[PDB]
Structures are given as structure tokens and as C-alpha cells.
Amino acid sequence: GSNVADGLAWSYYFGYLKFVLPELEKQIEKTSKFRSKEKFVKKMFILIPSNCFWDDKIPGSDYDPQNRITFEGNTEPLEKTRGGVFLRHYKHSVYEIKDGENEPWFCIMEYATPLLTLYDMSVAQPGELSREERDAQVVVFLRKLQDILEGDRACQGKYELVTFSPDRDLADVMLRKLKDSELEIGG
Amino acid sequence: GSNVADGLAWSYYFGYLKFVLPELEKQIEKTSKFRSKEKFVKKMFILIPSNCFWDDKIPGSDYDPQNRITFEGNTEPLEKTRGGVFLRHYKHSVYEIKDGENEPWFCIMEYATPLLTLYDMSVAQPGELSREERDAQVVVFLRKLQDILEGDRACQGKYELVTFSPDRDLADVMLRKLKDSELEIGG
Ligand SMILES: Nc1nc2c(ncn2[C@@H]2O[C@@H]3COP(=O)(O)O[C@H]4[C@@H](O)[C@H](n5cnc6c(N)ncnc65)O[C@@H]4COP(=O)(O)O[C@H]3[C@H]2O)c(=O)[nH]1
Q1: Total count of domains within chain A
Q2: Is residue B68 a known part of a binding site?
Q3: Which residues of A are documented as binding site for 2',3'-cGAMP?
Q4: N or C end of chain A, less CB within 10 A?
Q5: A151 with A101, same domain?
Q6: A130 touches chain B (CB under 8 A)
Q7: CA max distance for chain A
Q8: Quick check: B9 contacting A, CB < 8 Å?
Q9: What is d(CA A137, CA B131) in angstroms, rounded to the nearest whole number?
Q10: What CATH number is given to the structural domain containing A113?
Q11: Is residue B94 located within the same domain as residue B5?
Q12: Are B63 and B165 in contact (CB under 8 A)?
């Protein structure tokens, strides 16, 4: 078949999210600065740009036109062993998002790395994956990943999928989502 | 769909094989011992056990009942940047395979790591992937990976796919494949 996104969503889960999402809050809390910080939503915000593409660095990128996103630091790495072929250490980037004159938020943001395969495929093998087929596979990927994560009780409340057009301001998008998150002061 | 193997094969290529296979021989040649060694076939032997499962360490495992396989060392790591979400260093394991009283072979062997996802899926989500459906997906994975690698001229002659039942002796299998490889003395 040509439905690559199904396999991409399942391996993204079993090769990564299944074991980092339940532990993310605990990993974050290993750092005193992160324990001390309020307005630090502890969910992984998984970024899904509709064009499967991004600038390697989020702060100041085309998705951050107002330069309101700042890299703060990394979480304490988690150790995980599977198959012994190659070793795996997992860590995440914490960002600060300005909220006007108020206290800025901290959050975890990461592009959905399987989108790289959709992008690479559309550029190197256009006969296998047209631009339009890639657009559709992003949606398949999104809906399958949703089904997978919603079926795992250990992942509940630990992530948020963020879909956006490359024309949108990620700082504005994230700010709205952070304000809408369940986390309250002292939570 | 439920055809996860297609996506597994494509991301295995774009996320890994596409850039390690063309460079493998050159990476190997960075180590004097490996330059000096004869009977060192430079292809990556990609191991595809039909049950999608393996002991983390190949030497002395259930696939090596005669203990003829020995870990020799790792290749010099390759640097590759993609997406900036997480950093990537790639290296491979070199093994010695005994050939009776003759000079033993050196080779590169690696289990096909996407099989871990097929296995994990069959165990954690049997309703999604039955044992019998998993068996079939291994074959789909194999044939799709074959199509992908054979379509890339830069990968030609750089790999060999090795399929086998868990009852077979991997040392015996590898020995025949090494002898059948194109490499000649001084090559
Ligand atoms: N033997 C070997 N196999 C590798 C290596 N790197 C990747 N692979 C294999 O290709 C598959 C796709 O790699 P990807 O990096 O493009 O997608 C990755 C990546 O999109 C995501 N992921 C894994 N670790 C991540 C991380 N630390 N950060 C962000 N995303 C991550 O999970 C996906 C699937 O991981 P995986 O281990 O199950 O499958 C790999 C794996 O089977 C490697 O270095 N050695």
C-alpha cells in the first residue's frame, strides 16, 4: 500500500511516546528550577505543521515572527533499553513563552518527528508521494496517532497535538493552548 | 488501515539506511584494524527473524548455539542532522564469525529494528495485530524494504537482507552468505 502514515504513527508511539509520556512530569520535576516554576504546563505539546516542515530551531523561526519563544533548557534524560541494537537516551526541550507583561509560561514543545519521513519522501520520491498525497497523509497520521494515544490510559492528559498552517504564529497558538490547559497555580 | 509495515519500511530507510548504507564502507575504513583485516565483507547484513524477536546480544544467543559469533567492536560514528528535535549519531557492530580452522570472517550484522514495533504491537495490542497478522506483516515489511533499497542506486551492493526462522543457526546462515558475497581477497 501507499498508506505510510499508519506505520509512522504506531512506531512513533511504540518507539518513543509510549514510554516518555507517562514519565515526562516526573522527569521535569527532577530539576529544581522546574519544580520552582509556576505556569509550567507539563504536557508534551506535539507540533504538527500541515506542510511537514520546520526550521530546526523554534525560537525566532518563521513560526515565531514576534520572537516570543525562548529555549530554556532540556529535561533530565530518561534511559530506555529495547533490542540492544542501538542505545537510547530521551530528553525534551523546555521553552519560555512570553505572556505580555505577565509571568511567562514554560512548556514542552517538539515537532512530530515522523513528519520528516513524509517530507523527505515527497521530495526524494515524488512518484511515491505527491504534495497532495502528503497533505492527506498528515491527516491520516494525526487521526491514527489520536486513536493510539487515546487508547493508552497511561498517556491520558500527558500530551496535546497541535496542528497549524505554516502561516500561523506559533506563539499565539501556544499561548491559547497553555491558558486552556488544566494546570492551575500550585498544581 | 492495519498495514503498518509500509510505514515501518519507509521510515527505516529515510530515518536511517538512506544515509548510513552509502557511507558504511568508508566509515569502516577509518579504523586501521578494519583496513588491515581480510575476509571483512563490508555490506550491512540486516537480520529479519520471522518471529520479530531476538536476544539483545547476538554472540552466544539462541541463534548462535555453537558460539561461533563474537563481538569485535564498533565502527566510527557518523554524524547526521535532521529536524533538530534530537541529535543523531550512527554506529554499527562488527562481529567475527568462525570458519573452522580457517581465517575467521568479520562482518556487520544488525537486527531490523522496526521489527521491534511489530513485536511490541502483537504483545500489547493483540486486537490490532494478531500473531498471524504479525507473521504476514514481516513479509510485507521485507518486500517493501526490498523495493525501496533496490530503487536507490547509492544503496546497491551495500546491504543484504537475511530472513530466518528462530530455529536456524545464524552462524551457519552468515557463513554461507559471507562466502557467497562478491568480496575477494584484496578487495
Ligand atoms: N539500528 C538502528 N535503527 C535506527 C536508528 N535510527 C532510527 N532507526 C530505525 O528507523 C526507524 C525510524 O527512525 P526515525 O528516527 O526517522 O523515527 C523516530 C522518530 O520519529 C521517533 N523518535 C524516536 N526517538 C525520538 C526522539 N529522541 N525524539 C523525537 N522523536 C523520536 O520515533 C520514531 C520511531 O523510532 P524507532 O526506533 O521505532 O524506529 C526507527 C528505527 O527502527 C539507529 O541509529 N540504529
Answers
A1: 2
A2: no
A3: 16, 82, 88-89, 113
A4: C
A5: yes
A6: no
A7: 53
A8: yes
A9: 27
A10: 3.40.50.12100
A11: no
A12: no
H or E segment and range at residue B90: strand B88-90
The residue whose grid cell reads 520552582 is A36
Contacts of A5 in chain B (CB under 8 A): 7
Based on the fold, state whether residues A101 and A62 are members of the same structural domain: yes
DSSP character at residue A59 = T
B172 touches chain A (CB under 8 A): no
Q: How many whole angstroms separate alpha carbon B17 and alpha carbon B113?
A: 11
The pairing of strands A88-90 and A78-80 is antiparallel
CB B108, CB B37: distance < 8 Å: no
Distance CA B185, CA B119 (A): 40
Give burial (CB, 10 Å; 0-12/13-18/19+) of B183.
middle
Whether residue B75 lies within 8 A of chain A, CB to CB, comes out as no
CB contact under 8 A, B3 and A3: yes
Helix, strand, coil percentages (3-state) for chain A, rounded to 5, are: 40, 20, 40
Nearest to B7 among A8, A57, A81 (CB): A8
CA-nearest residue, atom 28 of ligand 1: B86
Which residue CA neighbors atom 24 of ligand 1 most closely?
A16
> How far is B167 from A34, CA to CA, in rounded Å?
51
Q: Domain limits at B127?
A: 41-187
Which of A14, A54, A121 is nearest residue B117 as measured by Cβ atoms? A14
Which of A53, A55, A64, A62 minimizes the C-alpha distance to A96?
Answer: A64
Task: State if residue A90 touches ligand 1 by the CB under 6 angstroms criterion.
Answer: yes
Looking at the structure, tell me whether residues A35 and A71 fall in a common domain: no
**Strands in chain A per DSSP E:** 40-49, 69-74, 78-80, 88-90, 93-97, 105-111, 159-164
Q: How was this structure determined?
A: X-ray
Query: Do A28 and A100 fall within a single domain?
Result: no
A25: CATH:
1.20.5.5200
C-alpha cell at B181: 558475497
The grid coordinates of residue A166 equal 505554516
Out of B4, B14, B91, name the one closest to residue A10 (CB): B4
Determine the distance separating the centroid of ligand 1 and the alpha carbon of B62, expressed in angstroms.
26
Q: What is the Cα–Cα distance from B114 to B140, expressed in whole angstroms?
A: 12
The resolution of the experimental structure, rounded to one decimal in Å, is 2.0
